[PDB]
């Protein structure tokens, strides 16, 4: 979906905040790393951040 099944990863991964924070940490950089308008990053920096967490979070 766009964002919905993401209610479990954070929910079940030790300290939630903590998660966030890293997740940003992704975020920030994993926009940052590429300022070449890579359309992968055409969408918001987080949401990727998330997801590729997500689907590595198996």
């Amino acid at each position: 979906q766009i964002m919905h099944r993401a209610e479990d990863l954070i929910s079940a991964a030790s300290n939630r905040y903590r998660i966030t924070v890293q997740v940003a940490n992704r975020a920030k950089r994993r926009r940052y790393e590429e300022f070449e308008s890579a359309e992968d990053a055409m969408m918001k920096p987080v949401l990727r951040a998330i997801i590729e967490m997500s689907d590595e979070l198996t």
């Binding site: 966030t20 924070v21 920030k28 300022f35």
Partner: protein, 707 residues
Amino acid sequence: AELTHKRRLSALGPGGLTRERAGFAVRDIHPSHYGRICPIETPEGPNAGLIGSLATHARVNQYGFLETPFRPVENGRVRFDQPAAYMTADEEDDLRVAPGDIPVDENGYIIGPQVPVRYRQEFSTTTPEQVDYVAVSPVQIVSVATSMIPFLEHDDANRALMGSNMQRQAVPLLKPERPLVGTGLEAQGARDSGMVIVSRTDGDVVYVDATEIRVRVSGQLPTASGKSTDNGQLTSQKGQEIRYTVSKYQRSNQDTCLNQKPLVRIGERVVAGQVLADGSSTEGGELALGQNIVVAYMPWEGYNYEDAILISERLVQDDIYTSIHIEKYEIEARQTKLGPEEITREIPNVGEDALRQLDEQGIIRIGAWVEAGDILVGKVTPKGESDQPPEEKLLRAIFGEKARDVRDNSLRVPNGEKGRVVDVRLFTREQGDELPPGANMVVRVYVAQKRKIQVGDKMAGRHGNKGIISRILPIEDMPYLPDGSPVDIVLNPLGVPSRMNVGQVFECLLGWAGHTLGVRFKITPFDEMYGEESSRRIVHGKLQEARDETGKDWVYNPDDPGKIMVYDGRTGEAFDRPVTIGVAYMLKLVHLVDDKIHARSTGPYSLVTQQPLGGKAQQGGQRFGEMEVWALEAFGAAYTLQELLTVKSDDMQGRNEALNAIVKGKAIPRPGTPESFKVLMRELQSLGLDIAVHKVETQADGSSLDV
């Protein structure tokens, strides 16, 4: 309103009370209040319970004490033939005393086997022996709007208040309309207001020109009764002569507007002091409040589920529900002791596309359409470049041109100002500018617009109400009728039983009638006829015949004594249960999203805190609530907070930092540190404070310069 506000009253007063040390009884009521002041009047604010309603009838004396009639009943016989009936000023009589109504037989004889009636603050029972004072009328406890309720007899008091204060400050409406339904007390009151004009004297109008009605210099028979049985300090001396100009749409003290209307056509007799002008809200000496509307209560697809109004686009096409407003804008010029400045007729970057519908000083042409960030007129200001900004001299000379900072903060009408301009009053040194000194010349001028109602319009009724609307809707999808017409106001249905305001039905109903058989009522509230649910009796009645003679005879069903059917689902099925509908008096308010809109992205901070500032302006602080900063940590994660103070409060270079970061593809950093803090610290340090504020991993800590 200007009724009421004729005559509220208070005890706020130099003389008055605190507003918080005048603690309680102060606030309450007192059976003196009964007949002396209305309880349905209450701002329900921290400054309420302090607004004497002024007995609907009272009057007063040289000792201020007000009157409230006590109508005599000669131990069984009233008929109002007895004397007195005109005192109980501020107090009573120690006669256990007849409340307003009670089954008052034909010529009085006052059935009630054994009637309750008030001794002094008490209300014992006793029968025609011992009383004698009683209503003038069944409502000596109201204040201008608490009477609107057509049948408050049937609605809870706790319920009747703010709703009764809604119409008290109702918005006007381009095209007015008496109500429908009738309790009718008011017409006269409208005349008391003045919006509607009665002859000063008399006449039978000649040409009643919209601009000039006339027993004025008529030359004609508005004259002659304008001389009916003539009078002298009134110039009957010559074809009578009653000159006075009607009003157009003028900016009310609250930017409200109304232009009355030439009502009485020509040559049609008049009579002394009878309203002949149709102002704001009467056709004819009655209170134009709202309009009359079919109303099937109906929890359909939501779009409303308290509170929440739904209405059909028709309303717009109906050309009704059309505010208009007109409001100052003005502007002025100083004469700077910095080296005076004027308006211009332009300066740069002016479109004439800007500068065009402009006029001959810079001025803005009147009767001209405007729309959004429009331009009033040409301020010309001073702003030299002694300390030419670093680029300055050159850039100027470098881009290739040598302009000059003669400036111009000329007036740009706010965005969304799609209003044709509609007057101006305006003037300079010469009349003697009656001018705030130090200032050169007035620029005040302004505009209105016809503007139909929209969403979030605080529209409702006149008795325990408060409403707004989502969405409006295709004149067709909305539910309609077996006769075949489509209706035009849902509600919800649960609303009212809950509001415990029932009668809204009533009217619905009653009105129904009205509408089906053009029925008028203008009848005081409170079923007192026979002394029971006659109301009922009424309703079903005026139904009955109405539908009887309505031909189709469907608008009423014996099995639906007050209902109707509701075939009109999404594709117009039969909704199921025969649901009731009818005619209500939807009345809109001001709280128009327009003047009640608000949102902005930063701008001028304050001075002192240098924090932006929300006095509810175009750059109005998104206001702020620490009760939420006492609910924003329940999850913490600072960041938002951290920002959430900082950089939008203290840090200059923060805030800006931001601006950049994004448009600078940069990761907006890290707080500044607050400073207002430092500000607070400063005064404290002076108040007698000291702080070493500091690192400590530093050589024996120290005192980091946080100043």
